[PDB]
Design a protein around this ligand. Structure first.
Ligand SMILES: COc1ccccc1OCCNC(=O)c1cc(=O)[nH]c2cc(F)ccc12
Ligand SMILES: COc1ccccc1OCCNC(=O)c1cc(=O)[nH]c2cc(F)ccc12
Lengths: 304, 304
């Protein structure tokens, strides 16, 4: 029993973190096989970040300008290339600690663990969600760039995120491991609109199921609703519209608790309309949306 | 910017987790040097747990009865001993992955990361606090016993907790690494009163400083208070009394923000008396007490 914002064990990712320096800028890199991946803004200076011409800045750089250090050992750089907003530095040694891995592009609403790093050294690990507007509400300071987001299935690490920047609004933006930004963001020091965010409805419902499994059931009511009625409430409260695909993913949790998905929607509807009345659910005084149905089943079953 | 319930990177601890089986019971063990530490209830059967006579149960066991497996390799057990509520199984091989480590007994109110494990395999990592009543509000299922709590300073892992049980109330109890339980708990399947818990006042104030550092400042007011006045409010709301030692630990955060400790106490006083009025602080709709002043400075400075 109990429910926590649990991150994946970061061990397999820690063994991949390196420091990358180019000129005066130092950030984090990800060493997998004989390649080191890092944000391309490592080649910029303060005067450049306002509107950098990355093709031009990279042309002034040579392999010997990218200093890559894995703990205390120096890696020899034998190739460099820019793919989208990431740099790929080919090194002469394959990382002996490379786990089985995949590069995946996550969907908005999905979750992942972040291993915050500074100067190539892991500082901490936390779980978060990719917001519907493609931002992440992370915890990152100066030098955190290049820290990565990932999920772990059995022995395989799926890397889904690399950290690039903090928007003026204090929210975070980054890319997949092929250097494509999530959302409309560009790696430039400019005002960037993160559009309207919404609450991840399927995750809130999954968390309500987790609450019931753990004994918090005060919010369960005598009502039911329909997808149409519920979605009118979802619209009013800036919640993502619930689809039959979301109901289908909630199937196993509906089966485990015996609470029909639409009945749980009616509990959520009453909580949106009346609030919590000073009560809590799983130690929270608000509706939590950072746990997917998969996360709930994983935590409630003990998948290692 | 941003503030997250950040756990330490679990890598150094993952390399220590093993599976320990005795008879029909399997749980987790901690392999450090040539010793494996695990909860002594691994030697019990269902009929025993109601009131086990551990001295007697252990006498029926021999070294060859404790099956210890580190991933896929079997460890040879050459000695066994019970120290308080832990068993120490001496093995013939020192763990090659043993990090620099200490065994520490944490104080109530302090925090640590937990690496939840099942069958000797890490499933997830989360940060938590040792409650003032010596329980932890963890996330643990069947087979989680032997999972450990720890803090990391530089390259040194300080182990402070080993998981033993879930009380009928759904809260968690365990020992230090010398097998002494935190609190009045015994490793018996019986009703056990976890006394009155309180909110960790110094941690709430530390979290209010973290909020100010990150831009959430709506709760700052034109008032001040005294330790005496504040403690009358703390008493009424089941908060730990604030002492000059707590004020002293908040010194650096008071210096960084320029907000006097007693002025922050007056903000906390108004929040206790008026509530949040439907607002949030650092994404929370309640007063968070799982971040120490040390945690706040660490996260806000980037200590790796
Ligand atoms: C506006 O800056 C950039 C824009 C596009 C691309 C790159 C940009 O910065 C590169 C450096 N960034 C960091 O090291 C950084 C990341 C972060 O998430 N939080 C921070 C908090 C701080 F107080 C200071 C810095 C950071
Ligand atoms: C009452 O049990 C004991 C009492 C004293 C000592 C040991 C006791 O149990 C030993 C086994 N315990 C677990 O594996 C366990 C731990 C936990 O934190 N959550 C759980 C949730 C479950 F649904 C089932 C089991 C657990």
């Amino acid at each position: 029993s109990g429910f926590r914002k649990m991150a994946f064990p970061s061990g397999k990712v820690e063994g991949c973190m390196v420091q990358v320096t180019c000129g005066t800028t130092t950030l984090n890199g990800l060493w997998l096989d004989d390649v080191v991946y890092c944000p391309r803004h490592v080649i910029c200076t303060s005067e450049d970040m306002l509107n950098p011409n990355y093709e031009d800045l990279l042309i002034r750089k040579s392999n010997h300008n990218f200093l890559v250090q894995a703990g205390n050992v120096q890696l020899r750089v034998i190739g460099h290339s820019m793919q989208n907003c990431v740099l790929k530095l080919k090194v002469d040694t394959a990382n002996p600690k490379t786990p089985k891995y995949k590069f995946v592009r996550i969907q908005p609403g999905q979750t992942f663990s972040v291993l915050a790093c500074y100067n190539g050294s892991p500082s901490g690990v936390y779980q978060c969600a990719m917001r519907p507007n493609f931002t992440i509400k992370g915890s990152f300071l100066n030098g955190s760039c290049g820290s990565v987001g990932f999920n772990i299935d059995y022995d395989c690490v799926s890397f889904c995120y690399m950290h690039h920047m903090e928007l003026p609004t204090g929210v975070h933006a980054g890319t997949d491991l092929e250097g494509n930004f999530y959302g409309p963001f560009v790696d430039r020091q400019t005002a960037q609109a993160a559009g309207t965010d919404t609450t991840i409805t399927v995750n809130v419902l999954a968390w309500l199921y987790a609450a019931v499994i753990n004994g918090d059931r005060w919010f369960l009511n005598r009502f039911t609703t329909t997808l149409n009625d519920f979605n009118l409430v979802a619209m009013k409260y800036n919640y993502e519209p619930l689809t039959q695909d979301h109901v289908d993913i909630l199937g196993p949790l509906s089966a485990q608790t015996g609470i029909a998905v639409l009945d749980m929607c009616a509990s959520l509807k009453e909580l949106l309309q009346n609030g919590m009345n000073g009560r809590t659910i799983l130690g929270s005084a608000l509706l939590e949306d950072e746990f997917t149905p998969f996360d709930v089943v994983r935590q409630c079953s003990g998948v290692t």
